[PDB]
Amino acid sequence: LHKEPATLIKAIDGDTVKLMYKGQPMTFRLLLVDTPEFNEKYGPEASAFTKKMVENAKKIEVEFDKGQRTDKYGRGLAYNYADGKMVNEALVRQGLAKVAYVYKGNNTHEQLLRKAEAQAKKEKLNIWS
Ligand SMILES: Cc1cn([C@H]2C[C@H](OP(=O)(O)O)[C@@H](COP(=O)(O)O)O2)c(=O)[nH]c1=O
Ligand SMILES: [Ca+2]
């Protein structure tokens, strides 16, 4: 896979962000994770975690997997990086997302993220507390 440039337009919630990609505004949904909705337990904390990560970054990148690049709602499906750190992985490592929505052929980073989830669960963090 390849990292490609993007710039932040606006934080949305734990697992969606509005970015400019190839010069066009797009909502991205993060691959292989699920954060609680803002109205659920840990939802606000997930939203804040992602917001801080993308707003503080100097360099935002997106990385598409091998399969579908947009979902049925028109959201881009990617792994998102903030100063080289994967947001998808960071959310799972902190117990603020579950590994989820693992579809065949868009699952390159599945085992990296399951390893993070096991570590967050071991530490009893957030969702796993
Ligand atoms: C992460 C992801 C979600 N989706 C779709 C499945 C879900 O459909 P439904 O809306 O019918 O439940 C929805 C979950 O996103 P949200 O967790 O953002 O609600 O997005 C994909 O199609 N591919 C994906 O990789
Ligand atoms: Ca969600």
Q: Cα–Cα distance between 33 and 93 in angstroms, integer? A: 11
The ligand minimizing its distance to the Cα of 69 is 1
Closest by CA position to 15, among listed 79, 63, 72, 61:
79
Give the resolution value in Å: 1.5
Amino acid letter for position 44: P
Among 15, 39, 47, 71, say which to mutate for ligand 1: greatest number of ligand atoms within 8 Å of CB: 71
The residues annotated with a catalytic role in the active site are 29, 37, 75
Which residues are within 8 A (CB) of 9 and not within 5 positions of it... i.e. 6 or more apart? 18, 19, 20, 25
Give the number of other CB atoms < 10 A from CB of residue 124.
10
Query: Burial letters for 34-55: b for 16+ Cβ neighbours within 10 Å, e otherwise?
Result: bbbeeeeebbebbbebbbebbe
DSSP bridge partners of 25:
20
Dist. CA 34 → ligand 2 center (Å) = 5
Q: How far is CA 79 from CA 18, 111, 117, 126, in A?
A: 13, 14, 16, 22
Long-range contacts of 124-129 (CB under 8 A, 24+ apart): 124/95, 125/94, 125/95, 126/42, 126/45, 126/94, 126/95, 126/96, 127/36, 127/42, 127/95, 127/96, 127/97, 127/98, 128/95, 129/95
Q: What would the two tokens of residue 31 be?
A: 């691959």
The ligand minimizing its distance to the Cα of 91 is 2
Q: What would the two tokens of residue 118 be?
A: 């096991």
Closest by CA position to 4, among listed 73, 59, 66, 42:
59
Q: Where are the beta strands (DSSP E) in the chain?
A: 4-11, 16-21, 24-30, 33-34, 60-63, 76-82, 85-86, 98-99
Where are the domains positioned within the chain?
A: 1-129
Pick one of 3.40.50.300, 3.10.129.10, 2.40.50.90, 3.40.1710.10 as the CATH number of 1-129: 2.40.50.90
